[PDB]
Amino acid sequence: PVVIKTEGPAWTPLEPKLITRLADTVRTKGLRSPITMAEVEALMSSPLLPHDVTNLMRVILGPAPYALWMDAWGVQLQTVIAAATRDPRHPANGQGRGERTNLNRLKGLADGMVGNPQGQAALLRPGELVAITASALQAFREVARLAEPAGPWADIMQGPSESFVDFANRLIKAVEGSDLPPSARAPVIIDCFRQKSQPDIQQLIRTAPSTLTTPGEIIKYVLDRQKTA
Amino acid sequence: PVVIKTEGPAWTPLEPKLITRLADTVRTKGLRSPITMAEVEALMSSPLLPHDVTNLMRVILGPAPYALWMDAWGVQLQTVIAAATRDPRHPANGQGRGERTNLNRLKGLADGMVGNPQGQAALLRPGELVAITASALQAFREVARLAEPAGPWADIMQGPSESFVDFANRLIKAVEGSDLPPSARAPVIIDCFRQKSQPDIQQLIRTAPSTLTTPGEIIKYVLDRQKTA
């Protein structure tokens, strides 16, 4: 993090207490939990310098996820630089050709920046910072989606002893965290409620005097009329 | 029983045939059955003299219930005499202090009454007779409620082989013949139908497309849709 003061942009590091709490969050909840992504968005609020994001991912991520994240961050930054050479009005670019932003300046590899966060904060633009930050966030999302797969939705059955809300949670999780289009999730969730969800609940849904046309309505109906046991 | 004729109040005894039938009714049906209380109300129609009620309870009740009934009758007569000294306009009392009614006159222990029903019928007032009769009826009710408890309602389950109308009869009996307020019997009966009444009928009541808000409606619904077996 940088503070743009009168003397110039002064760099302030992130608290190691927040970083330790975020690292333990990633350690217990995993990379893909919505609470973890919310915490990352929180610590991704102010535009960070390449040094900050690099050290942050070095600390919170293990070695192999860190390698994957470096790869993904490079790819996303390259897409950004292609869009930048496709539009001279990038908030990282300038009007003349002398302000064109090279990947050495984005990854912090340019002259006067390697290993020095103060000089980094000096030469970098705010548009550069926000582009780097958005790129790093998208790369984190990619790596998180890659490190742990969503479980195959079509293999999910309600166990003989499992409750129905746990089964519904697991199924909705695996269906929404999958490769289906957004407009195909609700019908699939409904038809999986009807064919999975062991034959007692199957018959309970089948003999519904009303027509249930939404996963929430099916869940409410089943929770009302379920066999207390 | 007394007949207030021109010569004076002449005492007529109750038929030993009616008394024998009532005694056998109490012997087979018990003290608390509504048919028994109706029969007692029937034989408690005309105002009886202390001799009549005393011999009646001696014949129809066993020894221990008769002791209990003597106790309860004394207590109720004492409450009556307290109300009488609290109001000089009692139909047993008179206007002056010389007509105040003592418990010896109510229990038949006063002078000219001990063991003689004719003299009893002579000196007693009709208000005295009706007060004695109501007191004896209330005492009989107390002793009947005391001799046999209502079964605990919260321990009633529908047996595996028992029909539903028998279970409903037993449950409504035990709930209405208990210490609950009158305004708390219907909700308790409903919630006991729902949680007792073994899981087939439990699920039958649970999956009711209509909302059942009365024990009679629940009974009708279950009798309609019950599994004939």
Curated annotation (Swiss-Prot), chains A, B:
It comes from the Viruses. Residues 51-59, 112-123 are annotated as: Involved in capsid protein dimerization. The record marks D179, D191 as: Involved in capsid protein dimerization upon acidification. It is found in: Virion. Self-associates to form the irregular polyhedron core composed of hexamers and pentamers, that encapsulates the genomic RNA-nucleocapsid complex. Assembles as a tube in vitro. Binds to inositol hexakisphosphate (IP6), which allows the assembly of the polyhedral capsid. Homodimer. Homomultimer. Homohexamer. This is Capsid protein p27, alternate cleaved 1. The chain holds residues 240 to 468 of 701 of the full protein.
